[model samples]
Target: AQNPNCNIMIFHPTKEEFNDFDKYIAYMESQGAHRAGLAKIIPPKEWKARETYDNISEILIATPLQQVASGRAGVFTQYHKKKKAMTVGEYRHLANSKKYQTPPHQNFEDLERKYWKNRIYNSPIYGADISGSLFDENTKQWNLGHLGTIQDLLEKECGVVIEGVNTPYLYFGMWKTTFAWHTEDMDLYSINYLHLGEPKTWYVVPPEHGQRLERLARELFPGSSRGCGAFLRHKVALISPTVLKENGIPFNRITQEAGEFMVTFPYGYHAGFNHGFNCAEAINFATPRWIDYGKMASQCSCGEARVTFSMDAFVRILQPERYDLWKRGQD
Candidate 1:
């Protein structure tokens, strides 16, 4: 049986609404748009055709990171060693190579065969995650990093320096390259805009289902995770939708085309793959509502004992006029 699918809301806000994105997002979040753990945005038609940096050639140094996915046979994904440096043009050629477009099949037999072909172990490629502005330095108005959304609260308000959380990162994807099931670091919200190329597939298991998904993943893999409910921190468990559906986890599957945006909610568990070669710029951000999540995450037993952003410090610094607002309220 096929996996059960869940609802994902896609909002097509007018230019005015999209311009005041933070307000729109907060209203939508209040309406339970985030219940799916993901939402998509359709930019105004003109914004869809917006131009970006002209000719990103060797100027963007790309380290070809290797990849592999074992499908349902086992869980493997996105990160392999960053083995060699290559020209973006040279790398794009390999990404265009049909031989490298590993087929993920609807036919279970075909899926298994290619899963073996990809290998009980196999190979894949994704262009480097270039950490910087995808837009020209002057285009701050349209820059997602500076989009001025309340979601930009993490750094814009608190003066934090978490690179991708406040700044933008450029990423290139080829068909079938995977981003394993996981949450953004420290349970932050993230946004990815497909600047160009083919549609990418994303699956989000809502925050309400977050722990159940972890419990099921651990049950499926059995002792593969050393830390309790922390498998997502280090391992890539790529369970197919069929497995999720049959096992009763609700996931929202989205095909993100060019000219669109995918927004991942704070603490949401998600995973996905590229349909073909595409250029996407993604970054993390959070609204005032995310403080509780950040604090709860601070208590997690994951490695590095990290807090993606300090809620108390952020509140103190951001609202110096009313510092005790949440502190006296917390506990």
Candidate 2:
């Protein structure tokens, strides 16, 4: 089918009567949390692990680095000594970087070595790997830190809103080519923003079509796989316009040039990927501790839910399930 203008047209947003930055920051600071602008958010809070140290050159922990060495928690531990208040850049620069820089073209395997697949031995969690690419080795672009506080400033000033569970104002990161298409575990929601380039496409197929479409994705899209459904960011626009509008759906341009949006798959098919020459960035807010809902869940989500990846089996053969959930609201 030919591309339709509906696909290219962005959903218009209605700005809320929210307060300005000073007011928002004042409210957040009143809640036991220091102003994020005044402090550096943690690395783990931002989605990076010790092995994924490429972003941060060095980190000083509240507890001795050796104390939490087994868990990589040290990487996120902050200084015990507290000061009045400073900018995000002021606090994290103790490690000497306002932001963790990457080598431009980093692949998933390289990210695994640098951030994921670190020794899980004698650790608290298993395979808490930051899988997927942070910087496509071939592409040479990087995600500007994931869960950083400075990002909080950008979110508020730009009027970007992420609807989901309570996320601490912070940044977690992966490089631009990382694939992160999956659902959130209640308390975690992603507030992703892109800076410096064209807008990439984000897809939302009905949960009931979970299994079929994922399979169809593999055959139709070059780099898609079962794991392809995992949460990720790419520099490419992968969806066709007619396809999106035919589904009677629209993509919300959450922000202006730095578009932001959130996806909460309380159940089935949800994913994201990117591929381009733009500077990419996103924020992931999660619990300080991994709870049962967070602990036992798969790397992503989809319970009693199929992970099929076939379009025909989906939009055609399994259209009943799609109609039931999306149209009939029978889920």
Candidate 3:
């Protein structure tokens, strides 16, 4: 059943609220929707992502033979320590080829060799760039990251794109394919729109459980966070609902259908898998209140050169202006 006051709120909005994507998210936050760490938004029945894309693509995870054959579930596992380039069309073709489900051999020796040889086949794509020439200004306005709050101001402050903070990324998925458990960069809020696909299964830890969730994630995948020296810093971990409950972690499940949106609040730790084949566009943003979280993320004692946005400019620029607006009574 669709819920109104449960862990994750599913919003059935009027046309006006749906059209004003950024403002609607803000309104929901004002109503304390962020407490869930996320909200699922269903568009008006007639609304459509009707947009299309170019032949452009990105590195996708084509083989998780080891992980699947080994054992893992639930949260997500977005880290592809290995990378390969495959077109969306070609990937779908491979998906239809119907690869075998069983392990190639019980021997770890044989599996290791096959792993080096690009062993099995799985299909999921992440962080692809959209063909900008295809969409219009009004459509751009509806982008949750394009509002004046974070993306625009950061660019104005740094006089550049502000380190990929505003670019919308495209993604592709197939059955059981996943994005790892983690929060957005610098603890910023994120919006993910399912353009077209089967429903995605999302799992999230509640706000009060944020610290416990991170501890569990780091303990589960120390390999991903080993040098990073922080939690939810990398999207390379996964867990099952059963295990989460077993550990006494409060979690919520969300079924995000095609033509719908998911809003992840600052400090929100989330991950999900595709039910089947699908495509989506997700991006990150920050509002005025997000500065402190940004500072906290930057302050984490990190190790040598893990890759996420650096927050030097974030502290130098916005940190000062925030209190001035406070003195002037800006909320």
Candidate 4:
């Protein structure tokens, strides 16, 4: 039988620590990302939703907005073709753009919201979160489990600072904003916490079967450039969950709601769409188990070439300290 908990997992944090169980099993079992999906909710008090949103939103709207530069916003068709760039602003106004106007036959406001959301998926407002820290110097402090702290350690230890890759990235999503198929940087694990608003629907492929799906994608789109160019050109070769199932590649689906945290293991391929206006903070980090994998990915993988910092540089710094820890860890 399959391990049953192979691909995606949800976490709930208490004042004490993080708890991991099949808290979302019924939700996961009953739905698929293709059909209606399930999102485990975390109350505002526990998740500190307000502070997270206010801190990030202030930075994003600090300057008057303009039409995004061409290709800077990643707008691609469902088939991964380049689409036109559109003007955008803070969440509220961008979601209300005339470009999202709808037909009289549909609910005008609702349909327009949906159209706008999908359009923005190709052009998600990046750098909104700036850093991975969800700390509001005035009122609140929050943690999204182990991966949250790992971001700090990478910068402190490796002398690199970004969000988690080298800085954490913040994302502002409106209805239907989507992220296409991809794995984490150098196949490291990722933690995404939906700070506030409606949920995000996720389709995930387990790490073990990711290579197989990659092979299938290569076989299917032999001519496509399946590298960094795909991202810049908004032409990512997205792998559909249904297509993976047909190829016998096992996967899991879930909807991650506000105040909740979603974790993806190394090499786990995931794609998702936002249900409504929302704010999310995501960062990547590697653990002891991922060191060897990171080394291999950095040296040999085509995707790693696009990463901002040198995984090779981090490894040279990481190995000796890891050796000391490993020696002490031995029984």
Tens digits of per-residue lDDT, candidate 3, 1-331, equal 2233437887888766666665777777777778788888877765544445444244343532212312343334443543465666665554444552223455533432333233223434332333232223456434543555564655654464544344666666665556557787667887888876566778787655678887777777677557556545545566766668888877887788777889888777787666556677777777666666766653233432243343434544545544343223211
- Superposed by TM-score, candidate 2 places the C-alpha of residue 125 at a distance from the truth, in angstroms, of 29
Candidate 1 per-residue C-alpha lDDT over 57-165 given as tens digits, one digit per residue, 9 for 90 to 100: 5544457777755444444433466757776666667778877664656643454334334432546677746776565455423457676433346665556543322
The best candidate by TM-score is 1
lDDT of 3: 0.59
TM-score of each: 0.77, 0.28, 0.71, 0.61
* C-alpha lDDT of residue 239 in model 1: 75
What does candidate 4's lDDT look like per residue over 1-331, in tens digits?
A: 3334463433344543323222332233333211111224343345353443434444443322222322212323343223333322355456545442222234434443454433533343322334445534442333433233444556555565544235456666665556666766556666677776666778776666666666676655554445422231232444555456677767777767676767666666777666556768777655545555555442222332233444444434445444343233221
Worst 10 residues of 3 by lDDT: 64-73
* lDDT of model 3, residue 162: 49
Worst 10 residues of 4 by lDDT: 64-73
Weakest lDDT window of 10 consecutive positions for candidate 2: 121-130
Model 2 stretches astray by more than 4 angstroms: 1-16, 19-181, 184-188, 211-275, 285-331
For candidate 2, write residues 163-210 as lDDT tens digits. Answer: 222222222212222222344432133334343333333444433343
